[PDB]
Design a protein around this nucleic acid. Sequence first.
DNA 1: TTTTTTTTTTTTGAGCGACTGCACTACAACGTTGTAGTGCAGTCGCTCTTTTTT
Length: 597
Amino acid sequence: AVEHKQLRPLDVQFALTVAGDEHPAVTLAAALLSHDAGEGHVCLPLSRLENNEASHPLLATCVSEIGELQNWEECLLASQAVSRGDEPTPMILCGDRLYLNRMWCNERTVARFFNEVNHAIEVDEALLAQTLDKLFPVSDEINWQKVAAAVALTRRISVISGGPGTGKTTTVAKLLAALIQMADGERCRIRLAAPTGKAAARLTESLGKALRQLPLTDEQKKRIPEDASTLHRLLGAQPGSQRLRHHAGNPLHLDVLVVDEASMIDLPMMSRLIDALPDHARVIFLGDRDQLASVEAGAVLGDICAYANAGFTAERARQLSRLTGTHVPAGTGTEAASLRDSLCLLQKSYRFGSDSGIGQLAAAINRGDKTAVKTVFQQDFTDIEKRLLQSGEDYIAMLEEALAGYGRYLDLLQARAEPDLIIQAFNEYQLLCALREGPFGVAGLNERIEQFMQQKRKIHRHPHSRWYEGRPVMIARNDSALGLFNGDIGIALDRGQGTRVWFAMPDGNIKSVQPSRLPEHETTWAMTVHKSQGSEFDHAALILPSQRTPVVTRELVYTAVTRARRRLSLYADERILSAAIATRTERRSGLAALFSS
DNA sequence: TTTTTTTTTTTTGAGCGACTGCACTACAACGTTGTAGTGCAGTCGCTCTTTTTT
């Protein structure tokens, strides 16, 4: 790539330190491996190192041995830095793919956890079918939520793959209800995990509004899951040291663990979660398959759910037909029956059907770009609009459409109404940008919107105060003492006691905080797509930069599409939208070979 | 090129020198038994200054 050629100094110093007095082939291989580890690739295939390097004949002229070191494997194994997996070496070459020792150890740990430990918990099928019939009222046709709950209560380790607006939390509530109704005398210490605190708060409020609906008992309401914790807080991560409280010796005393939003779980956090689990806990993973990749290097949920497209097993199809009492189709072939049985696919979305263009655009994002052009083209479904952004007049038109989007917010701001309706109107329209700085980014769009509110008589702003009435702020760091998390919006206004920032809590109330009490504050007229995950907006507007960047890809446009409830606007070129769909963010990892055997 | 969060302390004096208890033999009083000196081991006090120059 373009960034892969510009070598970081970390990779260069790693290549100069590890290889040192060895051949320059080992130096180039270590530099390429460190650059691919910095970009997020887990493994490095030797075919790309052999073919896509211009210095490969030069290093073929550099080595001088009896066998001349013609093969890359012999040239790497001749050095003391690469071994086959026996010597304590930094670089490991096992399956014609070179990795580091930590990445290889975590990949083998994940493969052992998802290949060997996942056994089948055999329970009574009649009572489970009765609870599934008494919980799900629909029994006329195939319901994917009932099959997901059955395959999550059947096996120990199960992954539930589903998009937003498909009723995932209702399925989790039905799964927990059938789990408690199945094991009556046996106690169940249900635990909930989340990667971020805002997603944990959303999970808590969702399961709170979901579990009070289903009829329970006095002992069943006592076993309701209390709260969802962060993965760094559940495992006990420290700021100074990386030592966990439940690292290897004492596992967490849990019966079932529901980890929501597994798409934001990287490989080291997954390996640290795996080593903390005992030999009897059942884990249920939640998240979307086509969602955005993890933050650090690694792709756990995508490489797990890639085998969900094959289908179930021949015995598992009959098992699901005996459990659900319906006709469950079988998957052709058998490669890994445990992982293909542990997976599930949610296709029936309840908040949007084929009449809405959002689901059709999300289905056409994973397909070719011409399908997305046809989805935007015919009649627009009264949901998706496309505005071309090339010059300054298109920028003025985009600012005018943002004024038309923020019209109700400014109308409720100028009328001096209650802040709850102001926040409810601000949470309906949202801009989503890719980069941070420049003309296309967070601080650029924020400063341009502030200058446009200074131009037209909509918002009065003092240049030296920095706390004018009506500015939207967002927090960047978590603060459990104030009750606000990362990614929460606040609106600064004057209620009569001074300029204070009102925040909308997920409990339904509003909290008025002093602006001096805010630890972090950044203007949020346009959010990034990575930082807007978990949230939901009624009217979203994507703004893509004209400069070609590897950030704008298929998963970014998919997360921008699924962020909108009803209305979505676009401000991008046609060539950028055509190139982002075809360029998929692939991450080379050894999970494709370890799960295949 | 995008981004995620985290709250738990822990330890630290030992060698020098005496006091007393237990054992063990040497030697004289009455082969055996009482008196005396020495050595080994557990336990306990103690103790590690002072200061000002452009």
